[PDB]
Write a protein that binds this ligand. Structure first.
Ligand SMILES: *[C@@H]1O[C@H](CO)[C@@H](O)[C@H](O)[C@H]1NC(C)=O
Lengths: 227, 213, 198, 215, 222, 224, 213
């Protein structure tokens, strides 16, 4: 019922700038204090800053690493929160959530953080976007033509995350597994998708993996034939 | 203004009890209200305690907050441990002019069924060899606990160069997955009679091997 | 002659005391109208101890003490006999044999403010609980550990008072409430404060 | 807001016994404690105020004491008319004056056999197509009696309801009504109407009976 | 001093009613007045006070739902009641308030009036004579009575010969029947030699239907 | 019901003193303070001070320290404001008001104001002596509507009163507020618009009365 | 002290229009300690509002107070014909202070002054004094520029002006400008004039005379 939805976030270079937005619903956004909280990869929660209610004076507070670099603001007319971000650093690489709590539990423009969004990823790197190579992991031409076989796709040497993979344009879902990516020494990512299929189908059924790398707009359909 | 200090991780068996501490670095812990949150991997956080020892409606009484003024510490005691409690936990409190989180505490449930890895191995593709590269792709799934070692072979020699290998990650079925990739040249793939991916788990070993065919 | 008791000058006062430094207005030698206290639309709390509220018009007292302060709605439940909690224990203790009335109303419109009203204070620590009607206004740094504080703050050495975070957006319980406590005294002296003689 | 408790919940004592009842407040109430007496279908009477001050026209056998949390009501010698529920009430916190849940005092009488009687239905009720056959166990003790309806000596079930009195304020007995109810047609399908009483005051189950049309 | 309650009866859920209490044998305007209720099993609840200074008091179980008032020019007290719930089903008493200095008490109570909050209609009783007979007789004594059947709700009230007979009278608590209607009996032990020389009448009164029935109980000769 | 009634108007020379009264009624006197305010002609409210009806405690605005003395009698229920060492900038309407800005018992700030006011007391301070007006005609000359008047000059104190044609002429009449001349004496004009068609046939006469001197001057106004 | 600025000092609104009067403090005033007053022509003032917002007893509900901190507002929801008056704000946060005041006046249509001029009477000249009067009759708004000219020399210091309150019939003003001289300075010159400029005039209306004609 209460819902928070962050927007913006992606690949940006150090010294650069971004603006995040967050749409709010199901509560009195006017009455709410609102805060941004970020989560660095494999690490804990850091409060970035707060904006009080218009009723409280509408003032903004900030953490140490982001004061004089970031700015929080709101459009109550659009029930929307913002974070302006300038002079970006490697250290600002995090998932950014917009946050507040129930109006029932407010004290000192604060309270429990009952409400969080999905969180938008910000990646601050000197590196540029790299689209993946997509290679067919063909089924091992042994087994027997009455049993199961496995076939897959290798999605290789890309940056940044995320990659998305499906099979037969979404028509194949059962027996599908898509594995966590390895971050290579090269600063690039490589990922694998695999599906289990009837051996007797390999001569008559078309198997295709569909790959989607939004940071580059790389979209590739790759057929996975027998050897 | 202040900071909140948590133990990095805590780990205990089902149906027992754990306590997570949250020590305030400066000023009294009891100056302002202390909250706690639960976060599962691939989810946003949720309130599990508010106002030192209150619970939001829907949280089991199993979770209980407290304050000790002596050790300047908040605490979260979690009792009757369940498979769902396997999560990362944070305390938070505030000043009039900043909101402060604790560093985090990773919880794990020391008592779930052992499962040996389902292992698959793919050879370099014709397309990749035509692109003048080679990647042996080893895929490791359905294992618990989430700790494995992986050791490649060229016929019998242990391969160490060209290997890129993941820290394991928890699957939808509470077991773990991992990827291992042995980078080669197209000639290295064909100078040896066979290449194997060996995976070791709870002292046991599982192997797949492939050859140019 | 037959001067009216100045209850208006405690209820209708512009500004109230911080509860650690509670105000006490002594009332003597006056005719009391308690009619202003009955059928009260604004009082979220009106409770009496050792007397019936009706019978305030039937009675006479040697002295009346009107004590006054601000606390949270949550904390008004501590301003009674046999109560414990930070306000009862370290700010304003009533005795277990208390003769009087406790009266309170929400004051978010008088005592909250844009940019916050951090000006109302409560005692967060004391070495013992208050005796009934004890008033502690010490700003001595509370030693919580084995190490002497030498009068300065740090590790286990804290200021003994804390500001109320009275921001206008505070939830109903967390908003400021003005509290007035009418202590009724009876002693050997002629009962100087009487109800209406009619 | 000062919940009030009483002990015991229920008491049984002989005529002459010193009955002592206790009351506990969840806070100190000094001497602001009142005691009341209620009998079946009656207004509560004030017995004591200020923990110990006896109300005008109360038998001097009633007394009260205690201060702070814990309070007493003592009947120096229980009498048949003292069959009652006794309540304590705090008068310290106002206007929210709280009562304790009460204490019932039953009289531990000597055994009495029921004077047992049976009545046929009225000719008016039979004209309104209905037959309520009534059985009365008058002035018996203790309260535990088993009644059994029989019609042409066949055992009856489900077609009878019973009502027992509270204890009498003078002889400290009970009375019990048992009422078989039938259609005019079911009443007329039979000849003999009987009420059998099993009670510890009876050496053997006592039947009272009539023949339909006797009287 | 006396207090007498009135206006009790049946009301529909969500509904409204006004209870009334008449005072006698004291100066009514000199005294505080109260309403206190008794549910069949949940104990005694104070529900309102009105003082001498137009001053009114209620618990949060009652705030805004009920409203107390006094007409001193009629020696009378009322409780207006609104948004009545199944759990407001109780005997409502009016009580005098008085005080020995500081020490406040309820010195006089009325007999109480019963309020039933249920989605039913009222029905007046049928009254049937339980005539005395040899089968009703033992040791110079005979039992007679009145069966008061098929009414709703409580209370039925019964007296004998305009209240001039009270010795040896047993009136039974009401049985709720499978028909949803109540029944009771009133019986009295009289000297068997008094039958046919003395007249016996049960005076039955049911306020929730305004039913009054003075049922003569004729003796049987057998 | 509640009422405050003040002393009548007083005329004074410089250096002297005035003692404005404030008879209170219709409320419990000793429960409310009395605040005092003054208003110079044609401008704003200058606060003078406050007194307790209960304990005689006072507050005075800095401007009046060592000149003002406020008192209350509780038997006649009457407040007074005495002002000494008078001068021209003490020429004002003085008001008393029942006070709920400060408590009469405890001297603390209250949620309220100056609720009930007195009718005011005019005080005028000047060296000038009682003089009747020198009345001068403002003559018309030569289309359809004309105007004529009287200059009413060099009088003290206020006021003068002026009708036209013994009150029979009121439509089109304007009398101006008085200006104090540097001489310490007042001056004003009364004028009236009249039909030009009847300028040389109607009689016009301004009816000046100066009650403070018992001067009456009915000055005829015609063309020249 | 805390100083109270009212704005505007004069407020021209139509009968039935909503009056909205500003009072503004030099510091944040306690919301409990501001009051508002009405002073009707020729009367003592009456309290309208206390505690910034509470109307006094017997004050019609058309009056209302509002605002907090620095900025406060008296709303009159409709100007009834009795409300064309002066209004003051007050504070007792710190000492006690009144606001400068705001007159509300009937917002009329523009009206051109009927300009007349009057020489000194011979009865005045006999005394050694001379007064020349200029009458601006039945005009609106109040703002008119009256230049005294004598043999083309502009006059200053030697003149005083007086103005009516707004007339009860047509809701218009009237103004008497008065030049004053010695007998000798009046006789020193020949041509006497007042040039009137006002919004109701397409060009300045001069009225003049020759001394002795
Ligand atoms: C305070 O004064 C107001 C009027 O300003 C009055 O209505 C009220 O009764 C007074 N309240 C008390 C409790 O004296």
């Amino acid at each position: 019922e209460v819902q928070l939805v962050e927007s913006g976030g992606g690949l940006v270079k150090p010294g650069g700038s971004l603006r995040l937005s967050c749409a709010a619903s199901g509560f009195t956004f006017s009455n709410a204090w609102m805060s941004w909280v970020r989560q660095a990869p494999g690490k804990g929660l850091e409060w970035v800053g707060r904006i009080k209610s218009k009723t409280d004076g509408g003032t903004t507070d900030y953490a140490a690493p982001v004061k004089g670099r970031f700015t929080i603001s709101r459009d109550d007319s659009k029930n929307t929160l913002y974070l302006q971000m300038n002079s970006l650093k490697t250290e600002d690489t995090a998932v950014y959530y917009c946050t507040t709590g129930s109006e029932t539990y407010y004290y000192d423009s604060s309270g429990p953080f009952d409400y969080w969004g999905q969180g938008t990823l910000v990646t601050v790197s000197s590196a540029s976007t790299k689209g993946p190579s997509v290679f067919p992991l063909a089924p091992s031409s042994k087994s027997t033509s009455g049993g199961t076989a496995a076939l897959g796709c290798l999605v290789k040497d890309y940056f940044p995350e995320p990659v998305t993979v499906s099979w037969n344009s979404g028509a194949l879902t059962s027996g599908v597994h898509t594995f966590p990516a390895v971050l290579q020494s090269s600063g690039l990512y490589s990922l694998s998708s695999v599906v289990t299929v009837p051996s007797s189908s390999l001569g008559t059924q078309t198997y295709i993996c569909n790959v989607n790398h939004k940071p580059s707009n790389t979209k590739v359909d790759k057929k996975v034939e027998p050897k | 203004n202040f900071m909140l200090t948590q133990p990095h991780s805590v780990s205990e068996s089902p149906g027992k009890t754990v306590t997570i501490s949250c020590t305030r670095s400066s000023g009294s812990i009891a100056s302002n209200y202390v909250q706690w949150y639960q976060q599962r991997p691939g989810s946003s956080p949720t309130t599990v305690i508010y106002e030192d020892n209150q619970r939001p409606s829907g949280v089991p009484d199993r979770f209980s907050g407290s304050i000790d003024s002596s050790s300047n510490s908040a605490s979260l005691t979690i009792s009757g441990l369940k498979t769902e409690d396997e999560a990362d936990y944070y305390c938070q409190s505030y000043d009039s002019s900043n909101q402060v989180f604790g560093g985090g505490t990773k919880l794990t449930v020391l008592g779930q069924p052992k499962a040996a890895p389902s292992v698959t191995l793919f050879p370099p593709s014709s397309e990749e060899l035509q692109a003048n590269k080679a990647t042996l792709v080893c895929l490791i799934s359905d294992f618990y606990p989430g700790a494995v070692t992986v050791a490649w072979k060229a016929d019998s020699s242990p391969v160490k160069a060209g290997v890129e290998t993941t820290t394991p990650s928890k699957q939808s079925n509470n077991k773990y997955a991992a990827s291992s990739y042995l980078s080669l040249t197209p000639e290295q793939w064909k100078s040896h009679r066979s290449y194997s991916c060996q995976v070791t788990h709870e002292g046991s070993t599982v192997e797949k091997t492939v050859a140019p065919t | 002659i037959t001067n009216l008791c100045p209850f208006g000058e405690v209820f209708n006062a512009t500004r109230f005391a911080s509860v650690y430094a509670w105000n006490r207005k002594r009332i003597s030698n006056c005719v009391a109208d308690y009619s202003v206290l009955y059928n009260s639309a604004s009082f979220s709390t009106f409770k009496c101890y050792g007397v019936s509220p009706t019978k305030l018009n039937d009675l006479c007292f040697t002295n009346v003490y009107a004590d006054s302060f601000v606390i949270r709605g949550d904390e008004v439940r501590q301003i009674a006999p046999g109560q414990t909690g930070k306000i009862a224990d370290y700010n304003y203790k009533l005795p277990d044999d208390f003769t009087g009335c406790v009266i309170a109303w929400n004051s978010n419109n008088l005592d909250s403010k844009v940019g916050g009203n951090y000006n109302y204070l409560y005692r967060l620590f004391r070495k013992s609980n208050l005796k009934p009607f004890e008033r502690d206004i010490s700003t001595e740094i509370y030693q919580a550990g084995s190490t002497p504080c030498n009068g300065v703050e740090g590790f286990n050495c804290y200021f003994p008072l804390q500001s109320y975070g009275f921001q206008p957006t505070n939830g109903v319980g967390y908003q400021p409430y003005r509290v007035v406590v009418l202590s009724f005294e009876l002693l050997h002296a002629p009962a100087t404060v009487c109800g209406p003689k009619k | 807001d000062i919940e009030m408790t009483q002990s015991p919940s229920s008491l049984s004592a002989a005529v002459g016994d010193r009955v002592t009842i206790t009351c506990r407040a969840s806070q100190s109430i000094g001497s602001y404690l009142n005691w009341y007496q209620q009998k079946p279908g009656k207004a509560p009477k004030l017995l004591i105020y200020a923990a110990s001050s006896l109300q005008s026209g109360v038998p001097s056998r009633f007394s009260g004491s205690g201060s702070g949390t814990d309070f007493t009501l003592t009947i120096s010698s229980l009498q048949p008319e003292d069959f009652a529920i006794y309540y304590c009430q705090q008068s310290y916190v106002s206007p929210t004056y709280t009562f304790g849940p009460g204490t019932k005092v039953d009289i531990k009488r000597t055994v009495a056999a029921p004077s047992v009687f049976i009545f046929p239905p009225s000719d008016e009720q039979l004209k309104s197509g209905t037959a309520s056959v009534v059985c009365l166990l008058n002035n018996f003790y203790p309260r535990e009696a088993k009644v059994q309806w029989k019609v042409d000596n066949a055992l009856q079930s489900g077609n009878s309801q019973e009502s027992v009195t509270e204890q009498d304020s003078k002889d400290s007995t009970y009375s019990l009504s048992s009422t078989l109810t039938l259609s005019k047609a079911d009443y007329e399908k039979h000849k003999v109407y009987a009420c059998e009483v099993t009670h510890q005051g009876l050496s053997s189950p006592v039947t009272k009976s009539f023949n339909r049309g006797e009287c």
